[PDB]
Design a protein around this nucleic acid. Structure first.
Ligand SMILES: Nc1ncnc2c1ncn2[C@@H]1O[C@H](COP(=O)(O)OP(=O)(O)O)[C@@H](O)[C@H]1O
Ligand SMILES: [Mg+2]
Ligand SMILES: [Zn+2]
Ligand SMILES: [Zn+2]
Lengths: 273, 590
DNA sequence: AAAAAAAAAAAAAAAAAAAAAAAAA
DNA sequence: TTTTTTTTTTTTTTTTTTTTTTTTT
């Protein structure tokens, strides 16, 4: 389906968006196996049975059955992965209509990505792409609760405000409340807000892989709401994620250069043991 | 729209040079070099300044005296040179890397008169910060009128548009690494601390410099700002980085072989087939040190080393041999250490009490430009895959000796400091020089008593060399003759069969070999170890244990590596056994 | 009794978390 | 007038050096 001007903009359009949506649904339904008839059938069955709200998807089979979608995947991971989540949600509901009461969302994890790089080989060219690396977890914070669907509370008229979905790039700023049209301070409403687990880890190059006259490099990664606790310090892990850059990271502060910090939005974690 | 006519003319001439310059063969060499510019991870073309001088002298002079104000135009010329030939991405950018600048300048010479113009300097890399994406020109949105101010050029500072004309996904980024260097020893003026100016590296040449390397940086000195105040700091922006003293004129054995030239490989292969290469290397590496053949052989085997291995259970078999030298003063111990340091690359020399724990193993600081932390490499780390020469070892504090013991034990340093943990690798051999307790070696005691080293430290020293100053007249006459001949004829009087550069190249090539151990060699090792244990059945300077079998295996491996052999013949085992047996000295007593 | 090694004091530097004020529009 | 970025201040901790103390010949 190579056509247009920009890959991310190409998926942005509603047309190809729905085309990919239905093609991925048909791939989930139809891709069976060499012999393991409809691997995704029992996959979804087990995930719903244990309430795992996740789906590990091999890249090899997805590329084989739908090469266009696999090609589009790494270029613009955010949009393709969101579409895959949307597709898998209704696929699960079709298989398990009652499971809709559980998490109202499904995450898609991608594994066995073909090209695997090293933390020292990361460059600006890899910005905003699905990338697979390997490393040792050198630090990992607690399971911090991050805002997911905030409902700020207007102080003046005590009216709770609608769900302002939290973005991993920018902090959500409420407008003026619809009722009393006040742009006041507002405060979170924890009782009515819903959150998501937020863990932050650091992944460093395996010492056995570093060269002689070089030091190991490290990159910060964010695990979100299902990959949390999947790692502990000292683990050798293969991490596939988005080399995200545009959240707030830009050393605009004085005595600073226009550098950009980088964090890997984790999408799949595999402990090698 | 005023046009910088000088810059435009420079661009035109540079493009003409790019599309016209021909090599000796007569082909457009830079066209061939650009052929590879299409592939991603490749956006820099290295252009030798000698070629630029040869083609258009006036253009070269203009570039040298106006490097900064024309560099963007040179990049544009390269982009035009490549675009019209192939189908490179439109948004992809390209950079011009210069090298072989005939003249070099000292860090002390970087006066303001050199700002914004081409120059090459030499320095020693102290530490390299991580690699980041850098914004050169992107997009800006006005929050007052939503008028998008587009492609505002950042000058080493977050520069919003100064006035409204009335994002990331649509911006161009370049790799950026701030690596700190410092002045070389030769350039240091009398009684002055070294100068450090943080050089800045960009795409392609963004990791060509590592901590501890001697590197030549070619580029431009620039000023960075650190009613408003104009506080400026000098900073070097390098378009290319190369080793100051290249090892090869042209990592696996074949890769190193191809890295070399034809003549270098001829030399290396010739010396590999050179019978008696052992003695030739010993003499050439230490021409001014009389006698002490055993110590020379030990340090040579140390420079080569053994073969590291990993056990099925994960246990690590040490494959790098350490050496210690103990004896009376003026036995040329510190001279051995200095020889090894000055000769071997990645060789770091220290003192007894002059180094603290952090500066001797590692330290952590926080990157001044991002949220990540960088690791200041201590002396042990700079010796990674090299050698660390610790003179006056016995004087070293215990708080540091524990770290050295850790490095010898597991080859690694574990740090938990300043908000970051890390397990870093230190594959270093240790050449120690320790004075005997009381300042003189007493022959009527075991080695354990003659020195103030803790038992764990001595345990993992493969070789101990004792240099007693027997007051023999023949030896004194020989030593005096050699020293006086040295001081009479300074430059000459040293006829070393192989130049230090040749030995460096041969060492780098041979280090890649991983000799095996044949069954015959295994049986020979077993018999030799049996005999060496029977030796301890008069008393020796120190007991003989299985660690001596490990040392013998490692020494045989190093001996095999010396001749670039692929299997450890029995002769290597015999030589290692003989050397280790000589290292053991009888504890004579009335 | 005097020297060598260890421990504690103490002073300077860094992180940082939060409250208040001055400058900007 | 109202925001915002800085300014401070107020705690706390950390690291280097020096000094003081303890153990051994
Ligand atoms: N066998 C020898 N051959 C040549 N020079 C020697 C020899 N022994 C001692 N010297 C000279 O004695 C000087 C002092 O030796 P040095 O290594 O400082 O003693 P130490 O080992 O106590 O530090 C050196 O400069 C060295 O040139
Ligand atoms: Mg000495
Ligand atoms: Zn309101
Ligand atoms: Zn405006």
């Amino acid at each position: 389906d190579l056509k247009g001007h920009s890959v991310r903009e190409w998926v942005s359009m509603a047309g190809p968006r729905l085309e990919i949506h239905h093609r991925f649904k048909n791939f989930l339904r139809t891709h069976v196996d060499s012999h393991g008839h409809n691997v995704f059938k029992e996959r979804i069955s087990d995930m719903c049975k244990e309430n795992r709200e996740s789906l590990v998807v091999n890249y090899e089979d997805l590329a084989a059955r739908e090469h266009v979608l696999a090609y589009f995947l790494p270029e613009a991971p955010a949009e393709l992965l969101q579409i895959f989540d949307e597709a898998a949600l209704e696929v699960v509901l079709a298989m398990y209509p009652k499971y809709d009461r559980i998490t109202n969302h499904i995450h898609v994890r991608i594994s066995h990505l073909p090209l695997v790089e090293e933390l020292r080989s990361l460059r600006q060219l890899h910005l905003n792409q699905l990338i697979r690396t390997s490393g040792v977890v050198t630090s990992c914070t607690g399971v911090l609760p991050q805002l997911s669907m905030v409902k700020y509370n207007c102080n003046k008229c005590n009216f709770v405000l609608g769900p302002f979905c939290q973005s991993q790039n920018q902090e959500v700023k409420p407008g003026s409340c619809p009722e009393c049209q006040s742009a006041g301070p507002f405060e979170v409403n924890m009782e009515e807000t819903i959150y998501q687990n937020y863990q932050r880890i650091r992944i460093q190059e395996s010492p056995g892989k570093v060269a002689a006259g070089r030091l190991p490099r490290s990159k910060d990664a964010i695990l979100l709401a299902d990959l949390v606790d999947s790692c502990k310090p000292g683990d050798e892990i293969e991490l596939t994620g988005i080399y995200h850059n545009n959240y707030d990271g830009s050393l605009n502060t004085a005595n600073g250069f226009p550098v950009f910090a980088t964090v890997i939005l984790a999408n799949h974690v595999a402990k090698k043991d | 729209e005023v046009r910088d006519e000088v810059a435009e003319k420079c661009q035109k001439l540079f493009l003409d040079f790019l599309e016209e310059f021909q090599s000796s063969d007569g082909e457009i060499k830079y066209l061939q070099l650009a052929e590879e510019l299409i592939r991603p991870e490749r956006n820099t073309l290295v252009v030798s300044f000698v070629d630029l001088e040869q083609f258009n002298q006036q253009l070269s002079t203009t570039i040298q005296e106006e490097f900064y104000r024309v560099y963007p135009y040179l990049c544009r010329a390269l982009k035009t040179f490549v675009k019209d030939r192939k189908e490179i991405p439109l948004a992809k950018d390209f950079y011009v890397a210069f090298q072989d600048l005939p003249t070099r300048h000292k860090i002390r010479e970087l006066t303001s008169s050199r700002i914004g113009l081409l120059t090459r300097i030499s320095g020693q890399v102290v530490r390299t910060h991580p690699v980041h994406p850098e914004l050169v020109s992107g997009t800006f949105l006005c929050l007052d009128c939503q008028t998008v101010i587009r492609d505002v050029e950042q000058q080493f500072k977050y520069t919003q548009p100064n006035i409204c004309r009335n994002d990331t996904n649509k911006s161009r980024f370049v790799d950026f690494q701030k690596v700190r260097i410092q002045e070389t020893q030769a350039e240091l003026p009398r009684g002055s601390i070294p100068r450090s100016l943080e050089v800045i590296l960009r795409a392609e040449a963004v990791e060509s410099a590592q901590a501890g390397d001697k590197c030549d940086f070619t580029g431009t000195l620039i000023v960075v700002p650190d009613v408003r105040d104009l506080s400026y700091r000098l900073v070097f922006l390098a378009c290319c980085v190369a080793p100051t003293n290249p090892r090869f004129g042209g990592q696996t054995a074949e890769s190193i072989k191809n890295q070399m030239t034809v003549k270098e490989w001829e030399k290396v292969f010739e010396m590999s087939q050179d019978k008696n290469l052992y003695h030739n290397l010993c003499t050439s590496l230490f021409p001014t040190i009389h006698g002490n053949d055993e110590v020379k052989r030990g340090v040579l085997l140390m420079l080569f080393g053994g073969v590291p291995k990993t056990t099925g259970e994960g246990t690590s078999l040490r494959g790098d041999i350490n050496v210690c030298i103990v004896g009376d003063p003026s036995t040329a111990k510190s001279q051995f250490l200095k020889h090894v340091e000055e000769f071997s690359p990645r060789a770091v020399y220290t003192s007894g009490k002059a180094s603290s724990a952090a500066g001797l193993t590692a330290a952590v600081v926080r990157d001044e430009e991002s949220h990540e932390f960088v690791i200041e490499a201590g002396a042990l780390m700079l010796a990674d895959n090299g050698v660390c020469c610790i003179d006056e070892f016995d004087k070293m504090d215990v708080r540091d000796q524990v770290a050295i013991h850790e490095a010898m034990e597991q080859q690694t340093i574990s740090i938990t400091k300043a908000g970051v943990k890390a397990t870093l690798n230190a594959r270093t051999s240790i050449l120690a020089a320790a004075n005997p307790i009381s300042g003189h070696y007493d022959r009527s005691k075991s080695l354990k008593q003659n020195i103030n080293l803790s038992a764990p430290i001595m345990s993992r020293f493969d070789l101990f060399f004792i240099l007693v100053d027997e007051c023999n007249e023949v030896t004194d006459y020989a030593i005096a003759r050699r020293i006086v001949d040295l001081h009479s004829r300074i430059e000459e009087s040293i006829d070393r069969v192989y130049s230090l550069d040749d030995i460096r190249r041969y060492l780098l090539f041979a280090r890649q070999f991983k000799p095996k151990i044949s069954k015959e060699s295994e049986d020979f090792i077993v018999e030799q170890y049996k005999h060496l244990r029977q030796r301890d059945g008069t008393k020796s300077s120190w007991r003989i244990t299985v660690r001596q079998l490990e040392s013998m295996i490692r020494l045989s491996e190093a001996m095999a590596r010396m001749h670039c052999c692929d299997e450890v013949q029995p002769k290597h085992v015999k030589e290692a056994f003989r050397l280790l047996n000589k290292s053991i000295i009888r504890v004579e007593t009335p």
